[PDB]
């Protein structure tokens, strides 16, 4: 098992853990802020997903400082994880293209 694949696997696991902790910590940051919607666990999990993917519909979003901090970690984990998958696909294609060229 080559490095770029172990890392893509590791990244994906690590993102799922960030999604779960982020859901949990978002609700804990946002309860106590009047008007907040990010305040029950099921939809916080959906919110962490659509944040990690950078979709950001706008149905849900943090309004407190620490919910916004949790959001940033989730965004970075998500962009980084998907970028690491992209970089692993690059490595696979580049290796395959070496062989196909006899290099």
């Amino acid at each position, epitope marked *: 098992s080559a490095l770029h694949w172990r890392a893509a696997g590791a990244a994906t696991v690590l993102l799922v853990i960030v999604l779960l902790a982020g859901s949990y910590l978002a609700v804990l940051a946002e309860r106590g802020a*009047p008007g907040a919607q990010l305040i029950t666990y099921p939809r916080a999990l959906w919110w962490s997903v659509e944040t990690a993917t950078t979709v950001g519909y706008g149905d849900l979003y943090p309004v407190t400082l620490w919910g916004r901090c949790v959001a940033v970690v989730v965004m970075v984990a998500g962009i980084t994880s998907f970028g690491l998958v992209t970089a692993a696909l690059a490595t696979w294609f580049v290796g395959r293209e070496q062989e196909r060229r006899g290099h």
Partner: antibody, heavy 118, light 106 residues
Framework: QVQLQQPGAELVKPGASVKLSCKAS????????IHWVKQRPGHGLEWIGE????????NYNEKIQKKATLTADKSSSTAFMQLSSLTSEDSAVYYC???????????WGAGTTVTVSS | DILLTQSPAILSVSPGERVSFSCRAS??????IHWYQQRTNGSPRLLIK???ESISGIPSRFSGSGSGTDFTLSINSVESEDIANYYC?????????FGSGTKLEI
């Protein structure tokens, strides 16, 4: 099973304070919140506050004067509300309720009748 | 904070007739409304969650409908045990709030 257990009654002299208890049984999750709800005679339900025992974070109703203070004892599965400096306006039935972090109060205590008098 | 309006405060119906309780939210709250029954000297009891979802242990008689700002709790064929106060509660925005309640009278 009875999932939340509360004492039937507390009498409190005016200006004094009282700690209300709520011992939980059944399933307890890291995610569970314990809520407190006040009901004055002839009146409706009034949301007072909430605490998450696993992390110890608590929130309070702002719209009403803040006499309360919420703690939990993870070891005893018991949540406490300290109402301090009480008046006749604080005499009420105080319920505790359990919410699994999904927004509704699935189970309630029998409530503690708190009477302020001399 | 979200104000929940329950009106009328009292509802008089005849035995076995359909009855409908109204809950109105001061702004759209999706389907994040739950309904409680409180009998004389009792504590509240969850009847319906998320506007229309059945709770096991609760007679089929009870139903819920609505979304947005207008919500209804319905009893098809009232009977004496249904004599209680009925409260709605929203969990869409913090803090959770309750309606002022409606009494059923037969």
């Amino acid at each position: 099973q009875v999932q939340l257990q509360q004492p039937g009654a507390e009498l409190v002299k005016p200006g004094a304070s009282v700690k209300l208890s709520c011992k939980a049984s059944g399933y307890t999750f890291t995610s569970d919140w314990i809520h407190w709800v006040k009901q004055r005679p002839g009146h409706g339900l009034e949301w007072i506050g909430e605490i998450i025992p696993s992390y110890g974070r608590a929130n309070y109703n702002e719209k009403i004067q803040k006499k309360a203070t919420l703690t939990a004892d993870k070891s005893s599965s018991t949540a406490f509300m300290q109402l301090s400096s009480l008046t006749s306006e604080d005499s009420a039935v105080y319920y505790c309720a359990r919410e699994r972090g999904d927004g509704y109060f699935a189970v309630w205590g029998a409530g503690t009748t708190v009477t302020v008098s001399s | 904070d979200i104000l929940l309006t329950q009106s009328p405060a009292i509802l008089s119906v005849s035995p076995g007739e359909r009855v409908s309780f109204s809950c109105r939210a001061s702004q759209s709250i999706g389907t994040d409304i739950h309904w409680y029954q409180q009998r004389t000297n009792g504590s509240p009891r969850l009847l319906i969650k998320y506007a229309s979802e059945s709770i096991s242990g609760i007679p089929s008689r009870f139903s819920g409908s609505g979304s947005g700002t207008d919500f209804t709790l319905s009893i098809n064929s009232v009977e004496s045990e249904d004599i209680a106060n009925y409260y709605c509660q929203q969990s869409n925005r913090w803090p959770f709030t309750f309606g002022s309640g409606t009494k059923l009278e037969i």
